[PDB]
């Protein structure tokens with residue numbers, strides 16, 4: 239089989255860390271196995287433009303392996319040219335960079351598999367971190383120190399404790415639930431969630447969560463909102479000017495899910511006007527984020543409220559080994575002709591939606 | 600009575616936030632309350648040098664109110680000049696900026712009271728935040744974004760999850776225990792503590808903590824160490840070159856307790872050499888931290904591993920109202936002649952140690 243593997247380039251950083259499996263230099267650490275199995279592997283980070291290495295190889299690729307941190311956008315146009323394509327794998331979690339609805343509506347026999355659970359703890363940690371960084375006003379505090387300044391009041395004037403705050407998650411799946419679990423000992427006033435899938439009652443009770451039926455009612459009462467749903471037609475552009483106007487004034491918003499769940503300029507405008515006190519997370523649309531993407535320079539009225547990073551929360555060194563192994567397992571399920579995929583890894587099975595988390599079908 | 604109140608100045612920032620009680624502008628909300636009682640209140644941030652406003656008023660001050668974030672250093676030289684001094688109050692927690700041992704050993708009839716518990720949650724949050732920021736490599740990640748860069752591998756090469764790490768606290772009192780409680784749902788490998796005061800077995804079991812009785816044994820097995828003990832003779836310079844040599848190579852160290860528990864240059868050398876991967880916290884010696892203090896510019900080999908802030912974790916807006924009210928209550932106990940202090944607030948009562956947490960007596 240011919241396999242095209244699209245990952246980020248480590249460049250000079252490859253020499254610093256041998257455990258960096260998720261880059262083009264290291265090929266998920268599965269290149270020996272793919273070679274021994276008799277497959278042809280094309281590895282590249284060159285994923286944009288008409289004569290990109292990706293596009294050169296799409297027409298006879300049997301399998302494309304992608305990673306959300308440097309996502310090959312497998313568009314309708316690319317799918318139409320991909321005459322041998324049978325499987326797209328996501329080394330990570332989240333398959334929205336592939337035009338899933340096009341595959342499904344046309345009934346094309348392409349499976350889409352991701353390594354469910356592989357980095358959900360990593361991201362839940364990152365959400366907790368980002369909440370704390372925003373609420374406690376850490377970014378300008380650290381900036382003060384490295385700029386050789388000292389003025390406690392400049393930081394304290396917009397620093398709070400997370401204790402006693404009302405916190406809402408949009409999506410209460412693997413990541414959203416783990417976020418709620420980690421918040422319990424911080425003594426929030428209340429933990430809320432919105433999801434068309436109810437939590438099991440035992441799970442709900444374990445974290446003291448209350449389900450809110452509609453998203454406007456959810457955000458209106460939350461001091462902190464975190465987004466933990468996949469990107470699909472039902473969540474694309476969900477966080478826009480109108481919905482932001484229904485947030486509690488001065489709320490903090492965390493989004494480690496997908497950038498395009500928000501309308502980028504609407505979030506920036508809300509931060510600058512004070513409707514949000516802070517926004518942070520690691521995900522952007524598109525990726526790599528352009529130099530003029532509004533989320534880079536946006537700030538609140540105090541020059542703070544921005545805890546943006548590149549997309550890396552799900553590609554910590556601990557997460558990388560897990561999604562690398564999961565990727566190998568999915569590939570083996572395909573190669574053996576067993577197709578004995580873990581049920582939870584299956585987004586599309588030969589064009590059919592198996593997941594329930596990407597909207598109702 | 601004459602009361603000297605030493606707080607940080609908020610300046611123009613006071614105009615931004617009404618709840619900023621902890622600054623010289625707002626005087627803990629007690630200025631009119633004191634005036635109505637016929638007391639004279641001198642308020643200043645000028646606390647260094649022989650003709651500082653502090654030193655001008657020391658000779659006839661009945662009461663000095665301090666705050667750790669901008670600490671009046673009540674040295675033995677100042678105590679010897681403070682002929683009317685009867686009470687020192689700490690608007691906050693931690694009384695080490697006062698020469699407690701000099702007061703005690705030379706029979707000075709001065710009580711020292713602090714607002715115990717007022718900001719212990721705030722600091723425990725800050726510890727969790729700092730642990731996450733260091734372990735997950737957040738600072739350089741955010742720096743990349745605002746420098747208009749994008750390179751996932753530059754961050755991922757030194758980013759880990761807190762899951763599966765062994766975490767040790769030095770001091771397991773109000774803050775240290777609250778840190779362990781907040782760590783439970785993060786699925787650490789193990790939680791450890793070192794303290795001459797044992798946790799009750801039930802409190803140990805609640806967080807799955809194991810006591811380690813030797814400090815070298817403790818740090819030798821820890822991926823993350825956090826300092827949560829007061830500054831006293833037993834902890835001053837506790838974290839020195841020799842102990843750092845016994846830390847696990849590449850450990851992360853967090854200190855929100857007091858700067859002087861660490862030997863400053865020893866920590867910086869350990870970071871630059873890689874014995875530590877990261878150091879962070881909000882506390883320094885002395886405070887305000889000099890522009891050339893080595894903890895400002897220190898970095899690990901990748902230009903990261905620094906999560907320093909000014910001293911503000913215990914002065915979030917949520918904390919300030921609590922220690923402001925507690926300061927009023929302590930003053931009332933003094934003024935009425937009842938001296939009905941909360942027992943947990945008493946560091947020294949007329950020179951005698953009441954606290955057990957500042958070493959054995």
Ligand SMILES: NC(=O)c1ccc[n+]([C@@H]2O[C@H](COP(=O)([O-])OP(=O)(O)OC[C@H]3O[C@@H](n4cnc5c(N)ncnc54)[C@H](O)[C@@H]3O)[C@@H](O)[C@H]2O)c1
Nearest residue numbers: 331332409411412413432433435467468494495551552595
């Ligand atoms: N930043 C990263 O590195 C990173 C890593 C992993 C995953 N993610 C993203 O997080 C998303 C969630 O991951 P997960 O493991 O929790 O997935 P999951 O499938 O376990 O949970 C997703 C939840 O979202 C719910 N949902 C779907 N549409 C919703 C809507 N309109 N409103 C509210 N809830 C809705 C689903 O019912 C489900 O319960 C992924 O799809 C991915 O886009 C990001």
Ligand SMILES: NC(=O)c1ccc[n+]([C@@H]2O[C@H](COP(=O)([O-])OP(=O)(O)OC[C@H]3O[C@@H](n4cnc5c(N)ncnc54)[C@H](O)[C@@H]3O)[C@@H](O)[C@H]2O)c1
Nearest residue numbers: 692693770771772773774794796828829855856912913956
């Ligand atoms: N960064 C901030 O804003 C901030 C805010 C509050 C307190 N603090 C500092 O944190 C310290 C702890 O606060 P707390 O509320 O937890 O106090 P606490 O009195 O409840 O607990 C202190 C613990 O440290 C233990 N201890 C003393 N010496 C020790 C030693 N050599 N080794 C190990 N343990 C030792 C004590 O036995 C006690 O259990 C304060 O004294 C203060 O210096 C900082």
Ligand SMILES: [Cl-]
Nearest residue numbers: 472473597598
């Ligand atoms: Cl939906």
Ligand SMILES: [Cl-]
Nearest residue numbers: 833834958959
């Ligand atoms: Cl001691």
